[PDB]
Structures are given as C-alpha cells and as structure tokens.
C-alpha cells in the first residue's frame with residue numbers, strides 16, 4: 001500500500017543511515033543499510049565493550065516476542081568483526097513488522113575505531129539468503145512471501161548533503177525518485193547484488209568487470225592495478241600509512257568513470273567521488289576511492305555511485321535497476 005520506506009539521513013556527506021526497531025516494544029536502532037551482506041545485528045545490553053556505551057542497546061528481557069536461540073555467531077566484514085549469538089524477535093522497518101532471526105552482538109572490539117566514531121548501532125543486511133549466516137530469508141523476500149508488500153524489491157534514493165534527505169523504499173518503485181530511463185542489469189551471481197559492466201576511466205578499461213552495487217561501502221573500490229594506472233601522472237599524493245589519495249579539488253586531470261552494459265551507460269564525474277577536506281589545507285580534496293583486489297577484477301559501486309544514481313534491487317527479476325537520481329524532491 002502506497003510505498004513503505006525508512007528515511008535515510010546523511011552523516012557528514014560520506015555515510016548515510018536508516019532507523020528500524022527490534023522487540024514488540026519497538027526499541028530503536030540506527031543502521032548501516034548494507035546490500036553487500038545478508039544478516040541483521042544489534043548491540044546487546046550484555047555487550048561488554050567500550051563501543052556499546054555510546055549506542056542504543058537491545059534488551060531481550062523487555063520484549064515478550066523475543067524467542068531465545070543462543071547459537072554463537074562471528075560476523076566477519078572486510079572492515080571489522082562483531083560477535084555474539086542468534087536471537088529471534090519482532091523487526092519493524094517503516095510500518096512493516098515480522099518475526100526475524102538477527103545477531104545479538106556482545107563484542108565490538110573488532111569493529112573499532114569505526115564503531116565508536118560513527119552514529120550507527122548496527123548493520124541491516126539487504127543481500128541474499130545463501131550469503132547469510134544461519135540460513136536467514138532476506139527481510140524484503142519474507143515481507144513479499146507474507147503479502148505485506150506487492151513486490152520482492154527495494155529502492156535506494158540516497159540523501160544529498162544540504163539538498164534533501166533520502167529513502168529506502170520497500171515493495172514498490174516511485175517515479176518521483178529518478179529522472180530519465182530506468183535500465184535493468186541482470187545479476188551475474190546467484191547470491192550477490194553484482195552485475196557485469198565494461199569499466200572505462202580515461203584511456204584504461206576492464207572488459208566485463210564484476211560490479212557490486214553496495215549501499216554498505218562508503219567508497220568506490222577499484223582493482224589495485226587499475227588504480228595505479230588511473231593515478232599515473234595525475235598530480236595526486238597518497239596520505240602516509242593510509243590507502244587514501246589527496247588532490248587539488250580543481251585538478252582537471254581527474255577522470256570520469258564510465259560504466260557500460262548492452263542497454264545502459266553510467267558515468268561518475270569527480271564531483272561525486274571528491275571529499276572536501278579544507279580543514280587540512282586550502283583547496284584540497286580526498287578521493288573517495290580505494291584499491292581492493294578480489295580474485296576476479298571487481299568494482300564496488302558504493303555510496304558515491306548511489307548518491308548520483310537511484311537504484312532498484314529486484315529479487316524476483318534477479319536484476320538491479322539504475323536511473324539518474326532526481327536532484328531536488
């Protein structure tokens with residue numbers, strides 16, 4: 001009905017979070033909404049670590065829909081590890097509710113310093129079942145199976161800093177969120193939001209590259225070889241000890257990413273991957289790009305791509321729909 005959604009709030013023009021609840025008493029948590037994972041976790045009142053002092057914590061004893069599991073789980077992300085045990089309780093996203101298996105986290109030491117530095121309490125996975133720990137049906141799929149929504153799909157309309165808030169819409173496509181044509185790219189993986197695109201950056205290209213559309217990566221990642229070729233004679237300087245590159249914001253050597261399919265063309269101009277850091281010096285920007293090598297040459301089209309392009313994640317049609325995000329409104 002209409003279209004169920006959760007508001008997306010920009011954090012310092014580099015991350016975005018949405019709020020959902022756990023327990024029949026609707027205990028509120030702030031989440032990274034992560035299309036690149038397939039589990040929900042919240043920090044427990046039983047959490048024994050420094051990071052949890054600054055967070056909204058889940059109290060299973062205060063929920064009468066809580067069902068004990070206790071199966072120990074370690075959740076290993078590329079950027080950190082959280083551990084605890086499975087619990088079952090009511091999960092509410094927008095105005096949609098369902099009983100759900102999630103991880104009750106008691107150790108966040110492996111998630112620092114990012115955890116304490118950030119406003120999110122946990123991570124809400126929007127991936128595929130066979131990627132999940134504990135064989136958990138994805139929230140959006142379950143809601144469709146329960147006839148709580150018209151379609152097993154969700155859309156990302158990211159917030160733009162000082163322009164507009166964003167929305168995760170569950171169960172329907174709103175035309176308000178995108179201008180121009182919506183192009184559907186079929187998945188090249190059984191259990192990941194990953195599509196095939198030719199990647200062109202200036203004179204260098206990777207043919208039929210694996211491209212993950214990842215709401216839960218706050219950067220563009222490119223293969224390390226590709227990045228080394230991109231940055232040759234570009235007048236950019238890497239930060240000592242850190243995989244981040246600094247440039248003059250006005251550096252006209254900075255290239256436009258061009259990603260092409262049989263039916264689509266997506267470009268990402270420097271304004272979409274530049275981060276102003278003028279506290280550090282005059283007219284200096286960081287590139288929101290990092291080198292990351294997968295066994296197959298892979299790009300992560302993270303936050304910076306999804307700031308520019310509205311995205312539809314369709315379980316039933318096993319495709320990602322891409323359209324230019326509407327600027328205002």
Ligand SMILES: CC(C)c1nc(CN(C)C(=O)N[C@H](C(=O)N[C@@H](Cc2ccccc2)C[C@H](O)[C@H](Cc2ccccc2)NC(=O)OCc2cncs2)C(C)C)cs1
Nearest residue numbers: 014034036037076077078079080114131214216217218219
């Ligand atoms: C400067 C810039 C780099 C910034 N990053 C941030 C926030 N960070 C740390 C990230 O986004 N980091 C990314 C990340 O790990 N994202 C993660 C969420 C997260 C965020 C913050 C801290 C800890 C975890 C979420 C991403 O979807 C990644 C994508 C991925 C998957 C496999 C292999 C490589 C990459 N997913 C996972 O790591 O999930 C693995 C799984 C575990 N169980 C099932 S799959 C990396 C891919 C770069 C703020 S500013």
Ligand SMILES: C[C@H](CCC(=O)NCCC[N+](C)(C)CCCS(=O)(=O)[O-])[C@H]1CC[C@H]2[C@@H]3[C@H](O)C[C@@H]4C[C@H](O)CC[C@]4(C)[C@H]3C[C@H](O)[C@]12C
Nearest residue numbers: 077078079080111112113114224225242243290291292293
């Ligand atoms: C998971 C990857 C490392 C992948 C890996 O294990 N790579 C081994 C091969 C290395 N090389 C390609 C250089 C060898 C090939 C030689 S070649 O000549 O081919 O280049 C590592 C490398 C740099 C890491 C980030 C930074 O720490 C900054 C920050 C610290 C926070 O706390 C957590 C978040 C964040 C964003 C980190 C996330 C993640 O953790 C990254 C991407």
Ligand SMILES: C[C@H](CCC(=O)NCCC[N+](C)(C)CCCS(=O)(=O)[O-])[C@H]1CC[C@H]2[C@@H]3[C@H](O)C[C@@H]4C[C@H](O)CC[C@]4(C)[C@H]3C[C@H](O)[C@]12C
Nearest residue numbers: 036131189191192193194210211212293294295296298299
């Ligand atoms: C081979 C590497 C893993 C790292 C590696 O180089 N070697 C480890 C071998 C495998 N494990 C030891 C984890 C097996 C555990 C079972 S064991 O029997 O060992 O206990 C490959 C094999 C399959 C890959 C994932 C899947 O494609 C799905 C998905 C595609 C996206 O594009 C990127 C994210 C993700 C989760 C991929 C991550 C990573 O890229 C994997 C684990």
